[model samples]
Target chain A: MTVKQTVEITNKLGMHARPAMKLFELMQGFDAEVLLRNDEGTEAEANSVIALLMLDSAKGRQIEVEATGPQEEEALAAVIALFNS
Target chain B: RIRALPAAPGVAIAEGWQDATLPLMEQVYQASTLDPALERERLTGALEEAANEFRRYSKRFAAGAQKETAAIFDLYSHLLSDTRLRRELFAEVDKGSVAEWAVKTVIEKFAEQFAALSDNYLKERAGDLRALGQRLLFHLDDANQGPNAWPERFILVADELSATTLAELPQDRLVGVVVRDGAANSQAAIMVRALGIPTVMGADIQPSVLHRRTLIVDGYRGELLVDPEPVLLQEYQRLISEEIELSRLAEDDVN
Candidate 1:
């Protein structure tokens, strides 16, 4: 199964190191392969903090998260919740 | 009174101590005739040593109620242990580059990537990466590991502050810090706030003007008073006392 969602980055400082670390940690628990894609078409594996940071997903920018695996629904929802909060 | 950005909340009156340490020289790329296995071993050892030092600093800050600073150190340790970074560095070593040169190349590549980011705050993280790289280089190179001779109690005035330099300084003796350049959210500034040191960042005055001067750093108001008058000094002294009392009262309430 594959789940995809588009969410806005709510963090004022964008997806910097700290938030990247948080997201990376959160992604490690799921059984899905999650990828975050910025508007510019740059995609980063959710497991790589450095790659996530390179996305430069600043405040107000929208990101498309695509997750594929057995737990894609749960993983996609969790990532969307992170961005919403 | 010179105005600047308030980086931390506190008041400090101390003699200004200018930083005179020479800048770290750039590492020039050099091909190595040494065996690749030996170079890899040296790189691994330096990485371990640097990560251990960062962890030690993290623990020290955590014990001192500076959890933010501790987290920064912990992040640095993680960066050192990053698998992608290590793999790239090892590949450079395998391609005949010396360990130090390989470290420089890989770290600079990462720093440049951060520097190219559009956000101002994110761009400053490039300095943090470079500072970590310098720590790794210090462990790999024997020439630059000398102790710093700083005054007993003084305000550090420098062009900019790095987390590594601030972490290695005598924390107890550091009353305040003044920098000519830095954002309030920079890693060094964040650490200063965690340590509860009065800090003024991006101050307009030159370091030379502050030499031998008894400086008052008012972090609450984002101001620096140079060789302030006796009356003003006494006024600030009273303010500092009041702040201390208020903090004590807050602690009592917590208890």
Candidate 2:
């Protein structure tokens, strides 16, 4: 079973470097695993460090997250709400 | 002073990461070591080389790429022939100034000259040429750097690195930086491009969040994504393996 959805950063400057790192740290909590992606999958690894850094993941740019495993849905919701914070 | 202006906008992202390095020049011709005779020869050599190169390149330009060549040679020729220009620079060198110092003086002096010109391309290129002249003069009398630096793939995080020194390598060579710093127009950006490697700038990256090579950016879509989870990685590996398997089937059939 898997659950996933895309979220947009509502912050003034986008997720930027700091928030992106925070996102990465937060995702480390779950073994369910996390992968935030650009619009096109061109393929993304939620676990890999270099991927997030390169995304240059901007503030307003929409990002997608795909979580797969037993608790993937709960994992997705927790991280998506991170943008709300 | 260092600066950056926009080139063609939008962004070009390259995957993989590397550090910039310039190997210090091996020649040991410092200004202090050279007597006035050698110093003068070094200066004269630079002027003559600039002239000869400009003349040959300019004619070649006139025949095919006239305007661009003309603009380039004009600066080269003017710098070579102008007495006032020569005097000011010679004063620096004669006063026992380092070759690098003299070129800095010339660059500051001619700032307005290049700035006044209307052509953006040539205007920008003028700085490159000026810097080139300065470096050449330095090498004539000072150790210069040769361009062979290989940096490994690693993540780097920074706001900017112009003032940072590139004098050594890291504990691990394959480091990439996720910088809070600059765009393609930056000096660091230019230096990176000259070295011919990959960088993702303007990430709006938060310093604390990036830990080395966390995300691999495709750059084509302005994206940086976290690496796949191990299971996902395995699936990706499988998918790629299957795709390659399928693609290999076509290898047996010619177009």
Candidate 3:
């Protein structure tokens, strides 16, 4: 199963190191493979903090989160919550 | 005349001074051995040690109730533990490169990538990467450590300015700062602005050429005038005086 969601980066500093670490740690608990796609069409694995940073997702940028696995829905929602917080 | 990016807004005139403690990028290291496995072992040990140090620092800061500072160290710890970074380092080591060279090459490649980014905030991450690389090198080499003693009042010239180094210096004694390579939005630059110091980043001049010279740093214009003409020096002094007067007037109005 594949689950996809578009979420806006609401943090003032965008996807910096801290938020990237948080997202990476959150994805570790799920059994799904997650990928984050920026508006520039660049895609990064959700587990790699460095890759996530390279996305350069600043404030107000929209990211498409795609997850594929048995727990895709749960993983997708967890990622969205991270963006919201 | 040296042109650079303005990092903070102010004007300062002082003698140029450079810190001797920091290692230069061009310094070469010899291969410890020809065994790739041994080199990988050494590299892994250094990485682990560096990461442990960062975690210790994070805990120290957290115990002191400095949560934000602690979080910064936590990020550093994560950077050290990054799997991609580790893979590249191990790959270099597997190719018979010494751990020292592998660390230098891999970290420099990543830092340059970050520095080349178009986003200002993201570009500043290059500094963090470089700082982490320095820490790893310190653990590997186990030498070249000393305290930074600043002169009374002078302009500091550095290859790369780290936030921790800037934080340790006496703000009043540091009249100005010039970096060979740095980003305007870096944490060090932010601290420089908060302290109202004149600063210029990505200054192209060699530190040797700046030695023993009277330097005028114009942060507003992002120019460094080295041993400027007497008339130019007088003009800058006048401008500095005017700025002081304007600030005084503004304070008076507030009162």
Candidate 4:
């Protein structure tokens, strides 16, 4: 299964280290190949904190999430929720 | 946009100037007849010297009540003591490589691994490891000292500039300072402010900015602008002139 969602980064600080770390931690809970791409078409594996930070996704920057595997839906939903929150 | 901690007040419109990259290491390796025991001893001794430097920095940070910064030194000290790192170094030396070569090879490998990672958080760790690696190499190379001189009317952009360097810089030649690493409590931060230059601390300045000939230093907003627009340049120029006029009026009032 493959799931995709486009989300606006609403975090006041954007995708900085702390939030990136949080996303990384969350990604580990899923058995999905999760990825995030910023508006600049820069893609990161979503598991690495450094990758997310390099996305340079500031507030209001649109990022899209794609997940594949058994937990695709769950992982994509969680990530989209993070973008909303 | 590089957002950093504002260290001083005012605006500066100037080009960026950075220190030239260090020359390549010549002592990377040499087929030497030294035994493994002697090489191991040499490596340990150099590690001790590097440890002492880190310890002193840690102590200084602790003395200033900056435990968070001190923790970074503590981490460096811990990495130095990693048994696995030493095991790798020892294994390399067993092949008859010089201590510098062994140290550089191992640390560079590790640094490259970290730097190659996509995570910015881990990517910065690459810098720390490389710095530690260089310190070890410096000790292994007999530790040379060289002085640095700066050009006039330029914005200083560096990963980190020592407090001594800030103190020695000619006031007339400096327009502003931008540091890519370290925080407001750091020695560079304090010194840059004491020098009364428009300064920004903790900016993740890009290499493209370093090579470019123009930038704007917005000290009040703690921003380093690269290839800024004409409108933005004009805005800052006005702000700078206003600052000068305000200073002149204040001086007249005092006189």
Give the top-scoring candidate (TM-score). Answer: 1
Q: Which stretches in model 3 have alpha-carbon errors above 4 Å?
A: A8-17, A29-33, A57-62, A68-74, B1-23, B29-33, B61-68, B143-161, B164-185, B191-255
Candidate 3 chain B, run of 10 with poorest lDDT: B245-254
lDDT of 3 by residue, B145-246 (tens): 333465688777886666645433445577788888767455665655665667888788788877768888878777788776789668655765776644
On the 0 to 100 scale, the lDDT of residue B30 in model 4 is 62
Least lDDT summed over 10 consecutive residues: which range in candidate 1 chain B? B245-254
Between prediction 1 and prediction 2, the one with superior DockQ is: 1
Q: Per-residue CA lDDT of candidate 4, range B1-255, in tens? A: 577778787778788876543434555656666769988887777777767766765675467534444544565565675555677798987888766677777877777656665544335556566656655655665655233455657766777754423333444676687777655445445545655678887876565647647877877667777786778668655765775644322322237
lDDT of each: 0.71, 0.48, 0.69, 0.63
Winner on DockQ between 2 and 3 is 3
Candidate 4 lDDT score at position B57:
55
What candidate 4 gets wrong by more than 4 Å, as runs, is A1-85, B1-32, B143-176, B179-218, B221-255
* TM-score of every candidate relative to the true structure: 0.75, 0.36, 0.63, 0.46
Model 2 alpha-carbon drift over 4 Å, by segment: A1-85, B1-36, B45-88, B94-98, B116-119, B126-134, B137-142, B151-201, B205-215, B225-255
How accurately is candidate 4 docked according to DockQ? 0.05
Please give the ranking of all candidate structures by DockQ, highest first, separated by commas: 3, 1, 4, 2
lDDT of 4 at A73: 86
Tens-place lDDT digits, model 1, residues A15-60: 3355555555556676777788876677866655465555654556
What lDDT tens digits, residue by residue, belong to model 2 across residues A1-85? Answer: 6677877655322332334444444555655777777665534464432243334433356667788877677677776665665
> What are the per-model DockQ values?
0.25, 0.01, 0.38, 0.05
